[PDB]
A paper describes a structure:
Members of the family Birnaviridae possess bi-segmented double-stranded RNA (dsRNA) genomes and form virions with non-enveloped single-shelled icosahedral capsids. An additional unusual feature of birnavirus RdRPs is their ability to self-guanylylate: auto-catalyzing the covalent addition of a GMP moiety to a serine residue of the polymerase in a template-independent manner to form VP1pG.
We have expressed and purified the IPNV RNA-dependent RNA polymerase VP1 and determined its structure to 2.2 Å resolution. However, when soaked with an excess of Mg2+ ions we observe only one Mg2+ ion at the active site, coordinated by the side chains of N389 and D402. We performed additional experiments, soaking ΔC55 IPNV VP1 crystals with up to 200 mM Mg2+ and 40 mM Mn2+, but these failed to reveal any additional bound Mg2+ (data not shown). In the structure of reovirus RdRP solved in the absence of substrate nucleotides a single Mn2+ ion is observed in the active site in a position corresponding to that we observe for the single Mg2+ of IPNV VP1, being coordinated by the side chains of D735, D585 and E780 (equivalent to VP1 residues N389, D402 and half-way between D559 and S400, respectively). Upon formation of an initiation complex two Mn2+ ions bind the reovirus RdRP active site. It is therefore likely that in the presence of template and nucleotide substrates a second metal ion will bind at the active site of IPNV VP1 and the resulting initiation complex will contain two metal ions coordinated by D388, D402 and the nucleotide triphosphate moiety at the tip of the catalytic motif C β hairpin.
Residue numbers in the entry: 11 to 19, 31 to 792
The structure:
Amino acid sequence: KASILTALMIPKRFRPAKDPLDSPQAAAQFLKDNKYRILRPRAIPTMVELETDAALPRLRQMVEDGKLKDTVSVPEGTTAFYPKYYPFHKPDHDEVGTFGAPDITLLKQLTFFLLENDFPTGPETLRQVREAIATLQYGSGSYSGQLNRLLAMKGVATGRNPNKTPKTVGYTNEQLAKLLEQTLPINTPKHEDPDLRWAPSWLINYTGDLSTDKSYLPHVTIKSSAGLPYIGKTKGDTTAEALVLADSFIRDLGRAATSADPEAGVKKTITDFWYLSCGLLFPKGERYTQVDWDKKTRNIWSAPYPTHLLLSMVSTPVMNESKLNITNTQTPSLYGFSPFHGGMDRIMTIIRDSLDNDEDLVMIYADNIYILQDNTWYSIDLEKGEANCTPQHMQAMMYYLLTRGWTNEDGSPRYNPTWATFAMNVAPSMVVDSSCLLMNLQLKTYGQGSGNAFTFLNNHLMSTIVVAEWVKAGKPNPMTKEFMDLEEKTGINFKIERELKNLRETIVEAVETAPQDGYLADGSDLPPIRPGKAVELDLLGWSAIYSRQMEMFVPVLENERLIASAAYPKGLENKALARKPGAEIAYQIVRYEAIRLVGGWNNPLLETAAKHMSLDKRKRLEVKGIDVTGFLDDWNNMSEFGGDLEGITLSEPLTNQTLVDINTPLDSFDPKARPQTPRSPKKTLDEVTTAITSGTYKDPKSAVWRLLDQRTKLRVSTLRDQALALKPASSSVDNWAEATEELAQQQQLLMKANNLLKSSLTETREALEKT
Ligand SMILES: [Cl-]
Ligand SMILES: [K+]
Ligand SMILES: [Mg+2]
């Protein structure tokens, strides 16, 4: 019985608090009170329509065939205005909806299945999912979170442990290159890949013939933001515009560098294209802690499309040929590592051999360092990695790419003076210690902009410096003051995230506790009643579990990430796909299959509930006669785990065979059969560090490489003379090597004049900030 009034008419949803910093005045005052640098704002000319065939003559046929729009919009208007960027912060105080909704259906299913099954780890799984729903929130944070994050970046760059250039730490570019030959081994781009000699639009071959139509340019994310000067547009809406701007920037830089006044011309070009150095401060979608919603929102520094394209032309042809890591090469690098197809078992073999031989082991992946020492596994992270970067760290990376990558077999460069100018003299100041845009505020960026094309490379170089210093200090244990003292020595902040003690014993336990029943145990299509012990390496988010069926370690997503993803799944996030009938149900099948694939299969309660949910949805589709095989075959794009499992289809339900297939190696592994690094093959990181400590490799031997190192020290007014010094090697003229040797000797002599010594990175920053 209820009242007529009533008759007439699980954790609660998180509602973010009202944000007092959601206005430019309140945000600017907050930054000023915290001594965070706000730049004097710069303006961008309004858009003007130009004919595509006049602006992009190489693409005339594409316009004629109606495959490319006949006009391009370029910032050449008579009036200039200050740009404004307003991100979407969801959920927020006024809107708590489907976006960022926890998976309450899964929570209810986990509860129903726990009541029917005696899984000993079931109560803890349910408690963890419930706790993640109650304490976390998937979404894009707030203005307060973004602003507090900027303060933390400034603190890392300038606070307790101010940043240090590699030169201040004590490394020349050549010494860093010698370390990188070991920690980031690279191959040269393919011989058929064009050298760095052209405007980007010249790398597009279009005639209409599908057999020959090709682009030699990097690939792009069509749906990603165009960045400045096209706020609110995607890369798909602005490709022709990005080509026009990237061609103009490189052309104007090249012409200015060899002009009668290189300083005036180069500074003018940099100031005219200032917006190419300013990133949109995009709030990253993550599973944030509810209590810290307004204290921390991670940011993506959204690079202008022309800058992204020019930087990617330098890095991508090298990196595409350099998937060299500890599982296939004798290097500490984890670049291109996948734990699938036997990857995790290769890591476990290396770890086990190190333990048996009483050897220390180090692995590097961008801002992640893994150390095995004293029967202990250490997972180390640079503290807010990107904030530690100086423009000189990126310049050292450019030096490494141009000397080890962009070089012909005879030692001649695979670039001309224009591209050496962009790469060495200008590019590092465009994305490091430059600026970002939030609302109408042009803010200083402390360190490198997170998300720029060189994010991984610059972070990897900073970790390389920390590791080289650890080797130099006699490998002090990560838990000691001697290890923590490397922060001040390098100017790079870091912290120990995990300490996995009694490693040898933990590995023995993982093998011995491997279940006899279920998936990868006796090979049935059921989770084990009692999962075995995981080796919680947190190796790029992965733990290792022993399989009795396959007699190898296989990866499982770290428990905490698995639980967070089960509690707050990412939505479809594609409005076009969402409007197609069956896309939502296909995405739900994908969500439950992918959570099982990455490690849910080994969690009996999670596996039971997720299997029921995907099977129930497949049965409904079968009864209804609705075919979603198309969406299920092309599942990767609709899953946060899509990049982890390429080449598999979800059209058939997950079975033990799926788990076997994703873990099957193409080849057997012998760690001793791994090739040595392409450069200095016989040398190890330890031998390189010893050589450096003794004062070796200060200067490269190659005259071409010496010109590139001198390029980092000479002021922009010397660019015309530097172009003349590089011209014989760049043109591969008869006797170029002797000519280069002579020109490098003459330039070294002229450098005795201190008035000619100024970093072009400082000159670039000054021109970018000019008002
Ligand atoms: Cl940031
Ligand atoms: K620092
Ligand atoms: Mg890490």
